[PDB]
Amino acid sequence: VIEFANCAWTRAIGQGWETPYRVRYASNLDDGPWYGMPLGGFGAGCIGRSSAGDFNLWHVDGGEHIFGTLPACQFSLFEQGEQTQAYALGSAPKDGRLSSWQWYPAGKGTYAVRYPRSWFVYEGVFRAQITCEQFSPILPHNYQETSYPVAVFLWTFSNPTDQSLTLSLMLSWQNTVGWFCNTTPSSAIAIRDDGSPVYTYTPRWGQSDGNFNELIQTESFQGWRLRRMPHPNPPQEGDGEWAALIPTGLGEFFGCSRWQPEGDGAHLWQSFSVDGSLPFVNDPTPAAAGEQVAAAFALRFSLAPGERKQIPVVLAWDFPVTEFGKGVIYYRRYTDFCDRHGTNAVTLAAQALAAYATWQEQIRTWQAPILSHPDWPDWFKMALCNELYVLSSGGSLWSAASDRDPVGQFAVLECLDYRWYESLDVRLYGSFALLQLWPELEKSVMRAFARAIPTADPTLRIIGYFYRGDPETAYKAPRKLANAVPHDLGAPNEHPWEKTNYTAYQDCNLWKDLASDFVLLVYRDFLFTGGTDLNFARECWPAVVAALDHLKQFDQDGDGLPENGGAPDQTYDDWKLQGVSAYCGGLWLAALEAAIALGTLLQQPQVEIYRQWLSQARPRYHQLLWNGEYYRLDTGSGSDVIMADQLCGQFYAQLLGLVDIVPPDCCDRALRKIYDTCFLKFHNGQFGAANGLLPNGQPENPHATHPLEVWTGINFGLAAFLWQRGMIDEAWRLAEVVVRQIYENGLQFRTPEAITANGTFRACMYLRPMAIWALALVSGGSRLP
Ligand SMILES: OC[C@H]1O[C@@H](O)[C@H](O)[C@@H](O)[C@@H]1O
Ligand SMILES: [Ca+2]
Numbered sequence: 162v163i164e165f166a167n168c169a170w171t172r173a174i175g176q177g178w179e180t181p182y183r184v185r186y187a188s189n190l191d192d193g194p195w196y197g198m199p200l201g202g203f204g205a206g207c208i209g210r211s212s213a214g215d216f217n218l219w220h221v222d223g224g225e226h227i228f229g230t231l232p233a234c235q236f237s238l239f240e241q242g243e244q245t246q247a248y249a250l251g252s253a254p255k256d257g258r259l260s261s262w263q264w265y266p267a268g269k270g271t272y273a274v275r276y277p278r279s280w281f282v283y284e285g286v287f288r289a290q291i292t293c294e295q296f297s298p299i300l301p302h303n304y305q306e307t308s309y310p311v312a313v314f315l316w317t318f319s320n321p322t323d324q325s326l327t328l329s330l331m332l333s334w335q336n337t338v339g340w341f342c343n344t345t346p347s348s349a350i351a352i353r354d355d356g357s358p359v360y361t362y363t364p365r366w367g368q369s370d371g372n373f374n375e376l377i378q379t380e381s382f383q384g385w386r387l388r389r390m391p392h393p394n395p396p397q398e399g400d401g402e403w404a405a406l407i408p409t410g411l412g413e414f415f416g417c418s419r420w421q422p423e424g425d426g427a428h429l430w431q432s433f434s435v436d437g438s439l440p441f442v443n444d445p446t447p448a449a450a451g452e453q454v455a456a457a458f459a460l461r462f463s464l465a466p467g468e469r470k471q472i473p474v475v476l477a478w479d480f481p482v483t484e485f486g487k488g489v490i491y492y493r494r495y496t497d498f499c500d501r502h503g504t505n506a507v508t509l510a511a512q513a514l515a516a517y518a519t520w521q522e523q524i525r526t527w528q529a530p531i532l533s534h535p536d537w538p539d540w541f542k543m544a545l546c547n548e549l550y551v552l553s554s555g556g557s558l559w560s561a562a563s564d565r566d567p568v569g570q571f572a573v574l575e576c577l578d579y580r581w582y583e584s585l586d587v588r589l590y591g592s593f594a595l596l597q598l599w600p601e602l603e604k605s606v607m608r609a610f611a612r613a614i615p616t617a618d619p620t621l622r623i624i625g626y627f628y629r630g631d632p633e634t635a636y637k638a639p640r641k642l643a644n645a646v647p648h649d650l651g652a653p654n655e656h657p658w659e660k661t662n663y664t665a666y667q668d669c670n671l672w673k674d675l676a677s678d679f680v681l682l683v684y685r686d687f688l689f690t691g692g693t694d695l696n697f698a699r700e701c702w703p704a705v706v707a708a709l710d711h712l713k714q715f716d717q718d719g720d721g722l723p724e725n726g727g728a729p730d731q732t733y734d735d736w737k738l739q740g741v742s743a744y745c746g747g748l749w750l751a752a753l754e755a756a757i758a759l760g761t762l763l764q765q766p767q768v769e770i771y772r773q774w775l776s777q778a779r780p781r782y783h784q785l786l787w788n789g790e791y792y793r794l795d796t797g798s799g800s801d802v803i804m805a806d807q808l809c810g811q812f813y814a815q816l817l818g819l820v821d822i823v824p825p826d827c828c829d830r831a832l833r834k835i836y837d838t839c840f841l842k843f844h845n846g847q848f849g850a851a852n853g854l855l856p857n858g859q860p861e862n863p864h865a866t867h868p869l870e871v872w873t874g875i876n877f878g879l880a881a882f883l884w885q886r887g888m889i890d891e892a893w894r895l896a897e898v899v900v901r902q903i904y905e906n907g908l909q910f911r912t913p914e915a916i917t918a919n920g921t922f923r924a925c926m927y928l929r930p931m932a933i934w935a936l937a938l939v940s941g942g943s944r945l946p
Pocket of ligand 2: 222223225342343398483484485653
């Protein structure tokens with residue numbers, strides 16, 4: 162019933178972790194290990210349900226994070242054969258709400274995920290065989306259903322006994338209309354102890370005044386709908402509705418539109434647990450001050466010995482507005498297929514009821530090349546799908562179409578701790594999945610970068626790295642310089658896409674990697690979507706020119722190579738570099754090569770300038786940095802550290818079909834050293850490749866941050882590089898280590914930037930690990946959807 166369970170992440174239902182990874186800094190986010198698969202489309206707002214059955218992640222407010230169970234949001238099962246049994250399929254509340262309810266025994270079945278499909282298989286409690294498959298229609302190359310705020314729960318019931326069974330399936334849900342908005346928007350921005358800017362989120366959690374629920378009963382479908390009176394027009398953030406529907410004709414429908422989710426639940430349970438019915442209630446009286454309201458329905462049916470029945474239950478949520486900074490209003494993409502009124506949940510659920518079997522067939526179809534691939538291990542097939550989860554839960558935005566953005570604009574947060582979008586350094590490896598599966602979204606992201614590059618905001622703001630607790634005294638830099646390459650596309654407390662370079666940790670006006678990243682991403686996106694989108698190319702080309710001139714100014718001595726200096730000036734933003742670095746120098750060489758290739762196609766005059774620079778810079782890079790076994794960190798520090806990601810530029814150059822930026826034998830020697838040192842002499846290869854070690858496997862400084870962390874996404878980029886250079890076995894072994902760390906130690910569906918050798922993590926729900934797709938791309942040959 163679970164298709165290809167070996168290519169799925171599995172855990173017994175409600176089975177926890179003895180010692181899961183924990184956050185390395187106490188100021189940062191750690192909700193604990195009970196993340197399950199997120200439900201809902203990209204930019205739809207999403208909800209997540211744990212492997213214990215709890216609906217515990219609430220991302221209905223775009224870009225905002227709420228973790229916590231609403232126990233009344235739950236499926237419950239009744240069975241009568243010889244005995245009678247009924248259970249709610251989550252954890253017993255720790256506070257004694259719903260005290261009359263019984264909660265399904267832990268460990269009596271399996272939870273399985275291959276995103277966007279998940280299954281609960283209950284076994285050992287009911288006589289019947291029961292599977293709930295939960296999915297949303299996440300569909301590569303589909304810019305419609307992939308945006309939808311719907312979840313399908315497909316239930317399969319089989320009777321293996323020779324005794325007839327009566328079953329009832331209940332869905333209850335609390336009405337949270339109006340909860341998911343910020344009552345303190347555009348709040349004072351603090352500097353956290355780590356130096357990141359943060360704002361205050363005060364949601365209207367538990368504020369249900371005016372909320373009301375109604376039964377839905379037509380010839381085609383029945384269920385309930387959750388609303389609020391009055392519903393303004395236009396809607397504000399938080400305004401909308403929920404609906405859940407089943408088809409008619411499957412059994413006997415009981416509807417109770419209004420019950421009390423903070424009470425003991427006995428009005429429901431007294432019926433349900435006894436015969437599988439509910440008291441009939443259609444009562445749309447709006448909730449009083451201080452009162453919570455929930456709905457429920459149940460479908461009762463018989464199952465003859467050997468019979469098998471399916472019941473599609475769909476859940477939709479229409480919350481059309483995403484407000485960022487006060488007054489900054491966007492509509493969600495899915496409104497392009499209904500409307501912007503916030504009155505369409507039944508329409509979306511009805512669509513889901515009609516199309517769910519098509520959607521499921523389509524998911525099977527796009528996963529089939531991955532699952533059948535002869536040269537990929539099962540653990541990899543699983544991780545390739547599962548790492549996609551972040552496109553839904555990473556505060557994802559997908560706005561309504563316009564003329565200049567015909568499928569909408571798109572953005573994933575860097576993470577929850579670092580609350581800004583599509584960080585350019587991070588997406589250099591993080592964006593490979595988006596490129597492969599939603600190239601139109603990928604291109605919209607890069608166009609947003611291109612539009613921002615010529616913009617400026619000269620306003621001085623505090624730089625977190627230097628902040629010492631006194632605003633008046635604190636070092637400040639201009640928010641953005643004209644033609645500098647922004648770090649990110651803004652934040653959910655300000656203005657995504659339009660107000661860029663939000664992070665204040667460093668002055669990214671000074672970064673020596675961003676410009677080269679920009680160019681490489683533009684050329685990659687053009688190249689890998691077939692080399693025919695001349696519109697994209699011509700739109701980005703002025704920004705390519707601006708970016709390369711921006712970065713050239715940091716070539717102080719005129720050898721052709723930009724020089725690192727000052728505070729950390731690249732993606733390793735705790736790590737000071739001095740002079741030409743392997744890292745930035747290499748990205749620059751690849752970027753020049755990219756601009757030359759693209760500029761030649763577009764017939765642009767700057768190509769000759771770039772060729773001149775490249776002719777000086779490429780030989781000089783090797784001449785300054787080759788030490789005999791690897792490339793030195795940088796020309797100025799005198800460090801002997803082997804930086805794992807030193808030849809990122811050579812990975813990219815070869816990926817883009819461009820000329821090698823270094824001699825190919827030196828590339829392979831360096832790569833061999835990195836593997837043998839950063840990986841095999843770091844705690845014996847137990848965690849993956851550390852970012853920087855001495856040739857003897859020791860830290861240069863034992864008090865360092867970045868050098869001694871294993872970055873998931875860097876590892877996956879390194880694995881792709883290994884594979885590309887013919888070190889196939891190495892590649893699989895490195896990638897395998899990192900996948901096992903994530904999936905075994907309680908980081909599933911919140912993959913972090915970093916793990917340590919001390920069982921800690923940094924920055925859960927991170928953008929970079931989607932770089933697993935880069936390994937898929939280099940190794941997939943012909944396949945991939
Ligand atoms: O983990 C390192 C990352 O830290 C984040 O705070 C930054 O925004 C990224 O630019 C950086 O690469
Ligand atoms: Ca908001």
